Amino acid sequence: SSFEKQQIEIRKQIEQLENEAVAEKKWSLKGEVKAKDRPEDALLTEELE
């Protein structure tokens, strides 16, 4: 059924969000960040004011 299909895509997305939520945050979201922690020249591409 169409509803079953929708539930399948929803389950896929819920799995993705599970892994993202458990996954350690990106460096930009870790609060304090030093040069060693982040990738080199990361600030150049990212738009920080």
Binding site: E40, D41, L44, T45, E47
Partner: peptide, 21 residues
């Protein structure tokens, strides 16, 4: 090998910079 990686990094930085402008 390393110098090639630095060259690629500079290329990527220049590309993003160009995209800003």
């Amino acid at each position: 090998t390393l110098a090639n990686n630095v060259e690629s990094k500079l290329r990527d930085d220049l590309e993003r910079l160009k995209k800003i402008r």
